[PDB]
Amino acid sequence: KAERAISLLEKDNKGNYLLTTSQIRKLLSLCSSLYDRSKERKFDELINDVSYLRVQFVYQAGREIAVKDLIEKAQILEALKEIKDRETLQRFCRYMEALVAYFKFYGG
Amino acid sequence: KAERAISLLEKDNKGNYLLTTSQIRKLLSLCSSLYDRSKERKFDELINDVSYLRVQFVYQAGREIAVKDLIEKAQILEALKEIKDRETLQRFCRYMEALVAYFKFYGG
Amino acid sequence: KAERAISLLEKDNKGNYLLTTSQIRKLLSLCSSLYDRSKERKFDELINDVSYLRVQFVYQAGREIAVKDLIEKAQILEALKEIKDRETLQRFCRYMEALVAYFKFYGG
Amino acid sequence: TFAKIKFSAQIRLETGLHIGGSDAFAAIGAIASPVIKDPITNIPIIPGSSLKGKMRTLLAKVYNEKVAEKPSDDSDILSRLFGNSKDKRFKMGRLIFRDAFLSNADELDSLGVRSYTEVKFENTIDRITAEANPRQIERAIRNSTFDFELIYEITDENENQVEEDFKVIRDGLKLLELDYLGGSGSRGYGKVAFEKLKATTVFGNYDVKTLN
Amino acid sequence: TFAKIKFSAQIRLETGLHIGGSDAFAAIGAIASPVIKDPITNIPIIPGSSLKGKMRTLLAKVYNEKVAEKPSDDSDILSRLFGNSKDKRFKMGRLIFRDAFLSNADELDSLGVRSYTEVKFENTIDRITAEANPRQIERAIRNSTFDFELIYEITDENENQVEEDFKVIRDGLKLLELDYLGGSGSRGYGKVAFEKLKATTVFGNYDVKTLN
RNA sequence: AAGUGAACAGAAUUAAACAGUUACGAAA
RNA sequence: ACGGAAACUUUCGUAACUGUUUAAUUCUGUUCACUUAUUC
């Protein structure tokens, strides 16, 4: 969950990451706005935001080279199919926060 | 909705797609400008844009070979007749984004 | 409007239409220059273009046999008398696109 | 004593300008320079932060005697109109703007428009080759009104400088019409025009003297 | 100190030109590059972005001392007139353009006209064969004017060379008359003509020197 | 009466992506 | 016929005063509407 996030994210390629935290404010805006809203109502009611969350990880993957190299390694599209319950979705929301904390520790 | 759009769009013919996301900004400019406007007022009020939206999928289908091969496979003209309600129109607007995000996932 | 035009235009006679997009570059220019001009000023001011549009469907209709056969089927001269208001004229301008978009769908 | 003077006016856009919205936060159409609009509807609204910073900029270059090195520190005759973060005498200003909304929708739909904002295509030349980097921007409509309300109030003690403050507000609004507002106005996109400049009293504590 | 000089002029078009508008974005007629017009009415307006990239290009090749290779980096006598993205001394430009609107509609209908835009038949020949690719374009009207306004202002310190800047703007506008403006004007489409080049003072802070 | 299918490239980039004046106020 | 009886951690007070998501920017570089033709 959070133990493998320190080794898989560090093992990359060339140093000096050109990607910061401002250019990734688009795909990281729906992940934080989903964990705090799925606990109020049921999971079968919100059927428009679930299908739209997968689109953000596809349209933004073919524009910048600093996006495709991270999704294929962290397996983001693989966990989008296993989830189906409200309790399972709560676990995926916590895994996204691990890829951001360890990213700013080695650089920015 | 989004599961069957990743396999039908990939199954095409010859590789190296010569059509980019900039030459199809005519038929895609009205669908994005209709979803944000239909959520405010009613559906029976806007009657001049519904009939004009279907014309874009017919006039632009005989001027380029990279358009007819996509409409007949994705079945775009079939969904234009089933819609009749404001809630049903919101579902067709989300399906159009699958033909744009997944199109640039394998190339551009 | 657009539903009954896809079946009436297809039902013709012998295939391989000789009427291409070259001999229709005269009557399709006044209709396109009418919807975008009638929305600015009033309808009672433009009096030299309304009466001139009906002349094009009378003098030019007798110069070729491939013109009268399309006007009588699409009923163009009938709608020229019912219109009288600025809002009604906007409806006839949108119907002209059905005779051009759907014409190139089966050939060109 | 304590009145609430309201300077109601109609901002008529003689030329379509551009305002940089929240990029990479909207829907799928986050490209082509997304313009900020209404968070509920689709009517484009103009923010008030671009008006308070632009009016103070053009005012702090003709009514002063020292080059402003840092904000909230320039002269004193105009520091009490917008505010001061380094002063100990006064803090709250006397000029409050408002996020004006496009109130021209009563007759805009009658003319039959396509959308509220269009997409304009531009590019640049590298002075060594032909066309390069086909960019694109987004602009608004032309000749559109906006309900602009200026909330003005006095602190009772500042009563002997009322007529002196009226000539400063009128000079700032007239000078703003001869300058671009918003963003990317160097090519000729801004240049606003305040239409129907009047004043009224809501609280009712001060007489009506000025108007135009 | 701070003045607002306005150079009012009338851009008379001696020959109908063509400007490539927003491609694949029109209304009822989007054939052969639809020319950009007004988002409210139908009168084709000229964009102000073409007047800034063409006038600066023609001026940066006669008043310079080094071959330029990228924008915002050519000599120094003209960098303060348009802008600079590298120098930290100045960032804002002193020249403000405006989307000139066609004010000739008050008497254009009296001469008996048909429409504002027409389709001109222009193709090409592949030399080795006969007619190939019968393309076409879309031009505007001929012998039309535009109410153009040039908003000029000084920054107080820029006062000991006011007369030096007047000879640069006058030479730049006169040189543009003998060159095509817009797009694809190599076949004799552009060639503007600035009519009634006068100056006036709106803010009223500097005397009137030039006139013709 | 007379083959008429605007062709071919780049699909928004390089600065800067929290700066400061500063914290239980008068009772048991 | 109880180390128990009797008891508001209470009143107090905008996380506040200043700020243009913008500086730089030609949707155009090449382009005959045409080969052939006695109003007798």
Q: How far is CA E10 from CA A59, A105, D53, E102, E144, in A?
A: 47, 61, 34, 10, 10
The total number of structural domains that make up chain B: 1
Q: How far is CA B27 from CA A61, B67, D29, in A?
A: 23, 11, 14
Return the number of other C-beta atoms located less than 10 Å from residue B3's C-beta: 10
Return the number of other C-beta atoms located less than 10 Å from residue E125's C-beta: 10
Length of chain E: 212
Return the number of other C-beta atoms located less than 10 Å from residue B16's C-beta: 6
H-state helical runs in chain C = 5-8, 28-35, 50-59, 65-74, 76-82, 86-95, 98-101
Smallest CA-to-CA distance from A76 within A84, A67, A85, A65 is with A67
User: Which residue range(s) make up the domain with B73?
Assistant: 1-108
Structure tokens at D204: 């009712």
Residue D137's beta-bridge partner residues? D120
DSSP structure string for chain E = ---EEEEEEEEEESS----B--TT--SS--SSSPBP--SSSSSPPPPSHHHHHHHHHHHTTTS-SS---STT-S-STTHHHH--SS-SS--S-SEE----B--THHHHGGG----S-EEEE--EE-SSSSEE---EEEE--SSB--EEEEEEE--SSTTTTHHHHHHHHHHHHHHHTTS--SSSGGGT---EEEES---EESS--S------
B92 min Cα distance to partner chain A (Å): 12
CA–chain centroid gap for D188, Å, is 16
Residue E201's beta-bridge partner residues? E5
Distance CA E144, CA E104 (A): 6
CA–chain centroid gap for D104, Å, is 17
Residue pointed to by tokens 């379509």: D16
DSSP structure string for D141-175 = -SS--BEEEEEEE--SSTTTTSHHHHHHHHHHHHH
A87 CB-near residues (< 8 Å, 6+ apart): none
Distance CA D140, CA E20 (A): 19
A73, amino acid identity: K
Strands D95-96 and D118-121, by their bridges, are unpaired
Strands D124-125 and E136-139, by their bridges, are unpaired
Burial classification of residue D174, based on how many CB atoms lie within 10 Å of its CB (0-12 exposed, 13-18 middle, 19 or more buried) = middle
Q: Does D62 touch chain E (CB under 8 A)?
A: yes
Smallest CA-to-CA distance from D184 within D68, D32, D27, D29 is with D32
E11 min Cα distance to partner chain C (Å): 24
Distance CA D93, CA D111 (A): 42
Coil, strand, or helix at residue D138?
Answer: strand
Smallest CA-to-CA distance from D51 within D165, D188, D176, D152 is with D176
E203 CB-near residues (< 8 Å, 6+ apart): D175, D178, E2, E3, E4
Question: Does the beta-carbon distance from D24 to A59 stay under 8 Å?
Answer: no
Distance CA E192, CA E190 (A): 6
Question: Does the beta-carbon distance from E42 to C93 stay under 8 Å?
Answer: no
Could you tell me if E27 and E14 are in contact, meaning their C-beta atoms sit under 8 angstroms apart?
no
For chain D, where are the E strands, in sequence order?
4-13, 95-96, 118-121, 124-125, 131-132, 136-139, 147-153, 192-195, 200-201
Could you tell me if D138 and D33 are in contact, meaning their C-beta atoms sit under 8 angstroms apart?
yes
CA–chain centroid gap for A58, Å, is 12
Q: How was this structure determined?
A: cryo-EM
Distance CA D83, CA D139 (A): 32
Radius of gyration of chain B (CA): 14
Distance CA B26, CA B57 (A): 10
Q: How far is CA E155 from CA E26, E79, E160, E198, in A?
A: 42, 15, 11, 22
Distance CA D47, CA D55 (A): 14
A94, amino acid identity: R
Convert E166-197 to b/e letters by CB count within 10 Å (16 or more is b).
Answer: beebeebbeebbeebbbbebeeebbbbebeeb
The resolution, in Å, is 3.5
In the 8-state DSSP scheme, what is residue D89?
S
Distance CA E116, CA E42 (A): 8
Identify the helix (H) or strand (E) that includes residue E120: strand E118-121
Nucleotide closest to residue D136 (CA–C1'): F12
Q: How many CA atoms lie within 13 A of A29 on its CB side?
A: 13
In the 8-state DSSP scheme, what is residue E144?
B
DSSP structure string for C71-95 = HHHHTHHHHHHH--SHHHHHHHHHH
Distance CA E92, CA C100 (A): 50
What residue ranges do the domains of chain E occupy?
A: 1-212
Could you tell me if B58 and C10 are in contact, meaning their C-beta atoms sit under 8 angstroms apart?
no
Smallest CA-to-CA distance from D28 within E19, A56, A106, E105 is with A56
Distance CA C34, CA C47 (A): 12
Contacts of D28 in chain B (CB under 8 A): 32, 97, 100-101
**Nucleotides of strand F under 7 angstroms from a protein beta carbon:** 2-7, 9-14, 17-18, 20-21
- What is the CA angle D113-D116-D117, rounded to 5? 120
A104, amino acid identity: K
Length of chain B: 108
Could you tell me if D97 and D150 are in contact, meaning their C-beta atoms sit under 8 angstroms apart?
yes
Output phi, psi for A99, to 5 deg: -80, -5
Nucleotide closest to residue E82 (CA–C1'): G24
Distance CA C32, CA B57 (A): 19
Q: How far is CA E25 from CA B108, D35, D114, E37, E132, in A?
A: 21, 18, 10, 12, 27
In the 8-state DSSP scheme, what is residue B78?
H
B2, amino acid identity: A
In the 8-state DSSP scheme, what is residue D206?
S
Structure tokens at D149: 């309300």
